[PDB]
Symmetry: C3
Subunit: 122 residues, 3 copies
């Protein structure tokens, strides 16, 4: 079981990976939408975590989600942002995000959201 994390913040990829390692899943990370788009989506992928504003480009992470959904890829996605206004949250939900989490986040919220994806997958 693989969950792709797309976030341009090095510390975030590090911190998030550590927090979720003791969960039954592999966290494969990407520093940008461009980098992730070169990735052959694995059949073992069950979910995704995406920073809403990749590289400080407002809503670029959500656009990535919208693009993937448009291309038929339907993986439960958790959208996260350390900066967010109401329209961004709404756009995220309309883009089918399973949840939108503001950062700094509460670890149990994230852990719970991921476990749910893990369980719903099996």
């Amino acid at each position: 079981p693989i969950i792709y994390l797309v976030d341009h913040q090095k510390d975030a990829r590090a911190a998030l990976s550590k927090l979720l390692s003791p969960l039954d899943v592999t966290i494969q990370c990407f520093a940008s939408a461009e980098s992730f788009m070169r990735q052959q989506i694995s059949d073992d992928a069950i979910g995704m975590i995406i920073e809403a504003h990749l590289e400080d480009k407002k809503d670029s992470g959500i656009e990535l989600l919208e693009t993937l959904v448009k291309r038929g890829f339907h993986l439960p996605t958790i959208v996260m942002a350390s900066s967010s206004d109401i329209p961004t949250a709404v756009r995220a939900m309309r883009a089918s995000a399973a949840d939108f989490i503001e950062k700094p986040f509460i670890e149990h919220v994230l852990v719970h959201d991921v476990q749910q994806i893990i369980n719903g997958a099996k």
Copy 2:
């Protein structure tokens, strides 16, 4: 033509530079206000883009603009900020900024302001 970019975030400098590359302009970066004050403003320079809170010191980017204005240097300046309250935006405008852009930013908004400086 040159546009000075003063932002303490390395990755940010790179991204903004890359984004503005296709435009008829060269971006010269500086990681801090002091680093910039060690600079004799060139005659080929037509504008600036400054992070409002350099090194987490609130409004320091705007104070740089304010001081530059007092020093006679007048270049259309785009002030950008991720963290921002109303007083900061108002200060930037009072400091003569051509625009105040919140980050995360909308790509074409920055591109448009820069092009407007180029055309000017």
Copy 3:
């Protein structure tokens, strides 16, 4: 006199120590709560400066303060945080923080806070 600084951001630690160095106090830094909890609190320590969201984990720095308070340790503490809400600020004040400073911060605000700790310690 020593003032402990706990902040996961390498750049912040350097910038804050530089800014405060001129004052009559020595700043000793820590990259994490875990690392600080290993430190034997010196008798010369007169205060602390703690990032509220250590390693992106919401309120983890405030949690640290709460733990110190429960251990009978009472050193005037300045909690600092970027991107925070009311509850976080309220939680830090309840944890007995001497002050709560939003970042980006106004330089003299932090300096005056520290100067105050120095004067009240002698």
